[PDB]
């Protein structure tokens with residue numbers, strides 16, 4: 001009570017938020033690419049420098065942002081994706097908090113360059129200072145958006161110390177893009193590090209090509225396609241033969257909830273109870289769960305790392321049977 | 329882009345935040361009690377009804393809130409605990425985001441009644457409506473604060489469905505109070521459910537009494553006191569004989585970082601590598617880690633469930649040796 005209850009300064013409040021949603025450079029790449037995805041992009045170019053500690057650039061060929069909404073694109077709690085509780089409990093987009101760009105801007109030097117098909121001119125914008133004041137100025141750019149995040153954590157020096165080696169940090173970025181590339185086979189994604197191209201995923205409107213290109217040939221050889229459907233619950237993807245799964249292959253344990261990369265304990269357990277009951281070790285897989293958004297809650301973690309299902313036992317059993325069925 | 333980028337309505341934005349910090353009634357109890365603790369309370373009375381789905385009342389004998397700051401006590405991003413980045417990287421209080429009361433208010437009917445030693449009159453306040461407008465009116469109350477949360481999730485009906493049985497929900501509350509009672513032996517804490525008193529922890533200025541009263545006699549009998557200190561790192565608490573630890577006793581695996589109930593994987597692993605190397609199963613313990621706030625980061629999860637240590641390997645090894653030493 002010595003200190004008066006007071007509203008935190010805009011930048012500091014955003015930095016507090018940034019600590020919860022932006023752990024490392026990979027986290028920045030994750031949010032910006034998901035933004036690009038929500039914008040209907042079909043091609044995404046990601047340029048990384050020094051593990052992302054120096055620069056993180058993401059360009060997409062999405063619908064872009066309107067000149068008079070760029071500042072809103074950087075303001076707290078501002079979003080174009082949802083506008084009510086009804087929209088929230090029926091999420092149909094990767095973003096919905098309207099916080100990512102604001103959090104990231106407060107902990108780096110972020111620039112937003114964009115143009116819409118209806119605009120003849122392009123514009124760039126950036127927040128700045130204790131009050132996160134926004135500047136919008138002229139620019140040259142194609143229809144679409146380019147995000148530039150430089151000096152990550154430069155104003156929160158203590159967080160930078162948690163940064164691992166550049167190589168390590170890039171590996172986490174590379175892993176994120178992997179997870180995202182598996183989520184959207186229809187999107188072309190190019191990733192470069194230090195001027196050199198590391199990968200270029202080709203869009204698929206046979207996914208076997210990309211699957212192998214992303215997870216390796218080893219997985220593709222052991223991969224068993226899945227097609228499981230009940231009421232409105234659907235399970236797709238691939239599961240490897242437990243008897244022919246190695247520790248290396250076990251590093252591939254990806255699951256998605258309505259196209260959103262998730263890491264659910266309920267899902268993994270269901271999948272294991274199936275490989276255990278059959279084999280009689282750690283399974284390798286790439287599963288996609290499709291469900292009515294009303295039956296799942298994705299507003300549990302600020303980074304969307306978790307989800308909770310309204311009918312927990314029903315969903316678990318659905319995946320169990322689904323996997324178990326394929327193994328036989 | 330069909331929908332314009334727009335600032336979310338105050339209540340909805342808070343509800344989005346509430347989904348990340350307030351999972352269940354126990355979560356509400358956690359935040360409010362921590363508030364009471366930060367306020368210097370030495371006695372805290374918690375009245376619960378129907379698992380907390382009906383009512384959650386917390387009264388403390390802390391310093392209270394100033395009349396002209398009650399609305400600020402409910403506004404977003406408003407706090408009296410920190411005011412700069414320097415304060416953030418040196419956290420010395422349980423709260424610091426200035427968000428809890430605002431999140432909780434948007435998902436229930438919350439009332440704040442309080443009075444300071446300098447005030448002759450008491451006042452109560454509550455946020456309300458889409459814009460979370462605040463009302464402050466006269467009231468009768470001792471020096472201290474009373475929080476009343478009724479109808480949890482009444483305006484977010486879908487979240488209420490995730491509510492388990494009243495008995496189950498109260499058990500999670502009971503567990504939280506347990507963890508908190510172990511964190512502050514010097515605080516009297518009374519917990520009641522449906523008019524009936526469930527427990528009453530007595531303040532200690534020999535902690536063995538409370539320890540037994542909280543974790544059971546079984547633990548007290550197997551408990552081995554710890555006193556480990558290095559540079560500024562300190563480890564205190566109790567660890568049970570692995571050879572004499574049962575699954576029931578394994579349910580007691582509590583650890584604290586600067587008095588804050590945490591569940592760190594680094595800490596648990598270090599503790600296990602010690603019981604493994606000695607015994608040659610799951611250990612039972614109550615450990616307290618004291619460290620310079622600059623060496624730890626507690627701004628990782630909106631609920632403060634996690635932390636990251638600047639010198640990870642140093643801390644892990646510190647606890648390993650600490651425990652390992654006691655087992656021998």
Ligand SMILES: Nc1ncnc2c1ncn2[C@@H]1O[C@H](COP(=O)(O)OP(=O)(O)NP(=O)(O)O)[C@@H](O)[C@H]1O
Nearest residue numbers: 035036039073079080095096097098099100101145
């Ligand atoms: N690459 C992009 N292309 C088009 N619009 C974008 C892009 N990045 C951001 N936006 C717009 O900026 C708004 C702000 O983005 P962001 O700050 O990430 O919040 P969000 O996507 O709404 N929700 P969240 O990520 O959950 O916090 C979005 O709602 C879009 O309307």
Ligand SMILES: Nc1ncnc2c1ncn2[C@@H]1O[C@H](COP(=O)(O)OP(=O)(O)NP(=O)(O)O)[C@@H](O)[C@H]1O
Nearest residue numbers: 363364367401407408423424425426427428429473
């Ligand atoms: N029981 C209480 N006694 C005295 N002051 C209180 C109490 N509960 C809340 N407050 C005051 O209200 C402010 C708001 O509380 P709260 O909304 O929980 O945010 P916080 O404690 O600052 N941070 P956080 O919990 O991390 O979001 C605090 O900073 C206190 O100054």
Ligand SMILES: [Mg+2]
Nearest residue numbers: 031035095100
């Ligand atoms: Mg987003």
Ligand SMILES: [Mg+2]
Nearest residue numbers: 359363423428
């Ligand atoms: Mg608090």
Ligand SMILES: [Rb+]
Nearest residue numbers: 073075078098
């Ligand atoms: Rb925004």
Ligand SMILES: [Rb+]
Nearest residue numbers: 401403406426
């Ligand atoms: Rb507040």
